[PDB]
Ligand binder design. Sequence first.
Ligand SMILES: CCCCCCCC/C=C/CCCCCCCC(=O)OC[C@H](O)CO
Ligand SMILES: [Cl-]
Lengths: 259, 259
Amino acid sequence: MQKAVEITYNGKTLRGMMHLPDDVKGKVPMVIMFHGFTGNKVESHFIFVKMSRALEKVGIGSVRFDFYGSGESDGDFSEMTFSSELEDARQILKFVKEQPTTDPERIGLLGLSMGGAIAGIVAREYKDEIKALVLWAPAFNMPELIMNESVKQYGAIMEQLGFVDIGGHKLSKDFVEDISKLNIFELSKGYDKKVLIVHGTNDEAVEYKVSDRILKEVYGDNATRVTIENADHTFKSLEWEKKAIEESVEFFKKELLKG
Amino acid sequence: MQKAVEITYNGKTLRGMMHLPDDVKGKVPMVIMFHGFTGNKVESHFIFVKMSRALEKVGIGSVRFDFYGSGESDGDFSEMTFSSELEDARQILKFVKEQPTTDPERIGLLGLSMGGAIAGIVAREYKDEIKALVLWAPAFNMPELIMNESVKQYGAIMEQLGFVDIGGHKLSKDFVEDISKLNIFELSKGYDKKVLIVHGTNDEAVEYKVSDRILKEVYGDNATRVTIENADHTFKSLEWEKKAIEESVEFFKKELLKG
Ligand SMILES: CCCCCCCC/C=C/CCCCCCCC(=O)OC[C@H](O)CO
Ligand SMILES: [Cl-]
C-alpha cells in the first residue's frame, strides 16, 4: 500500500510517500530514501518508486520525501543548503520512528548521490538505531565538486548575482558557503553496521573512484561494493536499474528481516 | 493550499497534487496540467510545481496527476499507451469537475510535450466545457516522432522483448501500435476557444516547426504563440521558465477570472 504523507516543522512542510507491505500487516522494517541534487523522491526514471515497490514485495516498507526547496515540498531551491537537507533528514527519520507500523529495530537508510552523503551522515549520527545503509553513487566528494565549480564560474557569477543558474534552479551563495565547510567522509566515519555501496563504473557525475575512497577512509570490513559495469550515474537502463534494485533489496532483506 | 490527491478507476490508482488559492470564497478557476513523455507531475526542474504556485497566487487552482505507468501512480511504463493516458486525462477532468471548489465554467488545460497532445485532444472532446487551453512544446507530431524511431530499430527488438528500453523505461509494442493509429492534429481540430502555445526555438525534442503546423492547421485566430528564443524543450533556465510560466498565468488570468 502506498499513501502520501506530510511533515510540518519550523513552518516548513515536507511532502512525501509511504509504502507498507499488503500481505504482511504488523510491525515492519522501514527504509528511508534520500534523493539527489536537483532530483526528487521519484528520482531518475522513477527508480526510487521502483525500489519502494520492490521492498514492499519482500515485506519491507519505506518512505521518501522531497527535501525543502525541491519537488512537491515547500520552499524555493534558493532556500536550500546541504545542512538544511540534513535537518529535513532528521525530521524524516523521526517521522518514520513514530509510525505504529514501524519496527524501530529494523530501520535502514538509502541515498543517491548527494542523498547518499546525507544518508552516511545520518546513519553515523544515529549509528545505534540504523540497522543498515545503502549508498547509490554516494557524492561524498560533493564539497570538492562544488568548490571547483565555484572557482570556475560560480564564484564569479555568485559574486555578481548572489546565485547561479544551474539549469532552471537558483543555486544560492548560502549553499556553496555551507558545503565548503563540510567534510562528508569524516562525518560518516564510525558507522559499524552493514553497508552496501552501488556504483556504475561509467558514472560521470560522481566518479567511480569516489567509492574507492569511501571503502578506504570511511568504513572497514562492514562495507561491501556492488560494481555495475558500464553503468552511468542513475543506472539509466532496465538492466542497470534492475541490478541496483535487486542487490539493494537482497541486502536489505538479509540485514533487516533475518533475526 | 497544496494537498495530495488520488483517483481510482478500473483498478488503477492515480496520484497527484491539488492547489487551491488560500481562503478566496466559493468556487474557483482550475487548471489541469498534463506532464510529458517519461516525465512526471513535478516535471523538469519542478516547472509544473512552480506553475501551480504561480497560478495559486492569482486565485487560480490546479491539479497535477502522474499518468498511469509514470511517477507516483500505479503501473509500469510498459502498460502505458497514449490512449491509456487519454483515458487517465478524462478521469482527471471528471475528478476536477466533481470537486465542490471547482467553478465548472472556468476549467483550463495545460500540457507539456506529449501532455500537450493530450490536452489538445481533450480540449476538443470537451470543447463546450473547457474554457481555455495552454500548450507547452506540444508534440502533435508524436506519431511520426515514434514511427521514425520504430521502423529504424524497434521491430526486431519488439518481437523478442515486447518492448524497447528507452533508458530505464519499457516502451511497449502496444504503445507503438496504438500511437500509429492516431492523428492528434485532426483530433484536436475544432476547439474554438482561446489557445496559448509556448515553444522554445531551440527545442530539440519537439521541433519549433510543429507549432507552425498547429497554428496553420489546427486552430484559427483563437490561437496565439509565445516564442521563447534559444530555449530548449522544457525552458531549462531561470529566465525561460519564468517567461513560460508568467505568460501562461497571464493568459489563464485573462481567460478564467472575469468574463
Ligand atoms: C558532470 C556533471 C556535473 C559535475 C559537477 C557538479 C555540477 C553541479 C551542478 C551542475 C549543473 C551543470 C550544468 C549547468 C547548466 C546551466 C545552464 C543555464 O544556466 O542556462 C541554460 C543555457 O546555458 C542557456 O542559458
Ligand atoms: Cl506526491
